[PDB]
Amino acid sequence: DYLRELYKLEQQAMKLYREASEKARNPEKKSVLQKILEDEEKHIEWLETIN
Amino acid sequence: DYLRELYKLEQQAMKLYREASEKARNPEKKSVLQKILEDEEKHIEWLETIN
Ligand SMILES: [Zn+2]
Ligand SMILES: [Zn+2]
């Protein structure tokens, strides 16, 4: 329930950061976005495993 | 408009994990949601770095 909603949010954030980092032309902006993305992907795995 | 949308998403996320953490009565679960909450907060900050 609350976990499914959290999951949906992450997937979306994951899918949004992926696009944004790929298009980012500033190197600093890209590295930041790509870095936050690793985090989102990780959050998804964390959500899949606690239980 | 990417940074703008990323930013809101992080806030929405932060609201769901706080609410999720607080209701959590399983110690482990709570530690996980609170840990990610912490990560989402970090993200808001990094985004302001390139805002
Ligand atoms: Zn996340
Ligand atoms: Zn985040």
mmCIF file of C-alpha atoms and ligand atoms in Angstrom:
data_model
loop_
_atom_site.group_PDB
_atom_site.id
_atom_site.type_symbol
_atom_site.label_atom_id
_atom_site.label_comp_id
_atom_site.label_asym_id
_atom_site.label_seq_id
_atom_site.Cartn_x
_atom_site.Cartn_y
_atom_site.Cartn_z
ATOM 1 C CA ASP A 1 0.000 0.000 0.000
ATOM 2 C CA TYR A 2 2.189 2.779 1.359
ATOM 3 C CA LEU A 3 5.096 0.710 0.076
ATOM 4 C CA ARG A 4 3.554 0.326 -3.378
ATOM 5 C CA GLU A 5 3.075 4.080 -3.481
ATOM 6 C CA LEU A 6 6.684 4.606 -2.396
ATOM 7 C CA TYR A 7 7.741 2.169 -5.111
ATOM 8 C CA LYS A 8 5.773 4.036 -7.776
ATOM 9 C CA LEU A 9 7.381 7.325 -6.691
ATOM 10 C CA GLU A 10 10.895 5.921 -6.952
ATOM 11 C CA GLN A 11 10.295 4.360 -10.371
ATOM 12 C CA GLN A 12 9.071 7.746 -11.581
ATOM 13 C CA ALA A 13 12.003 9.633 -10.009
ATOM 14 C CA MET A 14 14.283 6.990 -11.537
ATOM 15 C CA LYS A 15 12.715 7.415 -14.959
ATOM 16 C CA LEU A 16 12.883 11.217 -14.614
ATOM 17 C CA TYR A 17 16.509 11.502 -13.525
ATOM 18 C CA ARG A 18 17.531 9.080 -16.294
ATOM 19 C CA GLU A 19 16.146 11.399 -18.991
ATOM 20 C CA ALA A 20 17.468 14.570 -17.336
ATOM 21 C CA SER A 21 21.036 13.301 -16.833
ATOM 22 C CA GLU A 22 21.210 11.934 -20.397
ATOM 23 C CA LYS A 23 20.269 15.342 -21.857
ATOM 24 C CA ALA A 24 22.261 17.484 -19.443
ATOM 25 C CA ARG A 25 25.103 19.196 -21.311
ATOM 26 C CA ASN A 26 26.716 20.862 -18.269
ATOM 27 C CA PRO A 27 29.193 18.260 -16.905
ATOM 28 C CA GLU A 28 28.537 19.258 -13.283
ATOM 29 C CA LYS A 29 24.759 19.020 -13.739
ATOM 30 C CA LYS A 30 25.103 15.629 -15.439
ATOM 31 C CA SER A 31 27.367 14.097 -12.794
ATOM 32 C CA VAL A 32 24.999 15.265 -10.040
ATOM 33 C CA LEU A 33 21.890 13.913 -11.796
ATOM 34 C CA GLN A 34 23.567 10.604 -12.671
ATOM 35 C CA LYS A 35 24.745 10.342 -9.045
ATOM 36 C CA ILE A 36 21.270 10.974 -7.602
ATOM 37 C CA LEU A 37 20.009 8.321 -10.080
ATOM 38 C CA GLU A 38 22.254 5.634 -8.573
ATOM 39 C CA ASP A 39 20.542 6.528 -5.323
ATOM 40 C CA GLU A 40 17.018 6.165 -6.714
ATOM 41 C CA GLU A 41 17.827 2.795 -8.290
ATOM 42 C CA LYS A 42 19.239 1.728 -4.909
ATOM 43 C CA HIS A 43 16.087 2.917 -3.092
ATOM 44 C CA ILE A 44 14.085 0.689 -5.427
ATOM 45 C CA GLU A 45 16.231 -2.347 -4.455
ATOM 46 C CA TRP A 46 16.005 -1.399 -0.771
ATOM 47 C CA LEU A 47 12.221 -1.313 -1.109
ATOM 48 C CA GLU A 48 12.223 -4.724 -2.801
ATOM 49 C CA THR A 49 14.305 -6.346 -0.087
ATOM 50 C CA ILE A 50 13.090 -5.169 3.353
ATOM 51 C CA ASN A 51 10.725 -8.025 4.261
ATOM 52 C CA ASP B 1 11.939 22.471 -16.460
ATOM 53 C CA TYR B 2 13.663 19.235 -15.338
ATOM 54 C CA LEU B 3 15.283 20.514 -12.134
ATOM 55 C CA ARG B 4 11.929 22.009 -11.103
ATOM 56 C CA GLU B 5 10.130 18.674 -11.506
ATOM 57 C CA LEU B 6 12.943 16.691 -9.895
ATOM 58 C CA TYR B 7 12.776 19.006 -6.904
ATOM 59 C CA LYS B 8 9.020 18.560 -6.332
ATOM 60 C CA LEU B 9 9.366 14.792 -6.671
ATOM 61 C CA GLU B 10 12.012 14.808 -3.918
ATOM 62 C CA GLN B 11 9.664 16.756 -1.663
ATOM 63 C CA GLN B 12 6.702 14.468 -2.378
ATOM 64 C CA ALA B 13 9.021 11.570 -1.663
ATOM 65 C CA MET B 14 10.226 13.162 1.584
ATOM 66 C CA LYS B 15 6.634 13.532 2.731
ATOM 67 C CA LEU B 16 5.829 9.875 2.028
ATOM 68 C CA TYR B 17 8.931 8.467 3.723
ATOM 69 C CA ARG B 18 8.480 10.622 6.839
ATOM 70 C CA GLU B 19 4.843 9.546 7.083
ATOM 71 C CA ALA B 20 5.993 5.997 6.276
ATOM 72 C CA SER B 21 8.799 6.010 8.872
ATOM 73 C CA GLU B 22 6.585 7.382 11.643
ATOM 74 C CA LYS B 23 3.871 4.755 11.235
ATOM 75 C CA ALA B 24 6.455 1.992 10.920
ATOM 76 C CA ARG B 25 6.401 -0.137 14.049
ATOM 77 C CA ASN B 26 8.955 -2.682 12.891
ATOM 78 C CA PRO B 27 12.365 -1.320 14.004
ATOM 79 C CA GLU B 28 14.211 -2.517 10.894
ATOM 80 C CA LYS B 29 11.613 -1.152 8.464
ATOM 81 C CA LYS B 30 11.693 2.227 10.208
ATOM 82 C CA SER B 31 15.500 2.376 9.976
ATOM 83 C CA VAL B 32 15.204 1.780 6.236
ATOM 84 C CA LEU B 33 12.519 4.366 5.454
ATOM 85 C CA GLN B 34 14.284 6.928 7.692
ATOM 86 C CA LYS B 35 17.585 6.155 5.917
ATOM 87 C CA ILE B 36 16.071 6.857 2.495
ATOM 88 C CA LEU B 37 14.297 9.932 3.826
ATOM 89 C CA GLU B 38 17.759 11.129 4.756
ATOM 90 C CA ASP B 39 18.872 10.384 1.180
ATOM 91 C CA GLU B 40 15.977 12.285 -0.370
ATOM 92 C CA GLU B 41 16.837 15.282 1.851
ATOM 93 C CA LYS B 42 20.440 15.103 0.644
ATOM 94 C CA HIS B 43 19.109 15.220 -2.945
ATOM 95 C CA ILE B 44 17.083 18.415 -2.413
ATOM 96 C CA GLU B 45 20.347 19.958 -1.248
ATOM 97 C CA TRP B 46 22.398 18.703 -4.205
ATOM 98 C CA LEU B 47 19.762 19.966 -6.614
ATOM 99 C CA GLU B 48 19.954 23.447 -5.014
ATOM 100 C CA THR B 49 23.681 23.122 -5.814
ATOM 101 C CA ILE B 50 22.839 23.288 -9.533
ATOM 102 C CA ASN B 51 19.567 25.249 -9.350
HETATM 103 ZN ZN ZN C 1 14.577 7.625 -3.722
HETATM 104 ZN ZN ZN C 2 15.945 11.296 -4.338
#
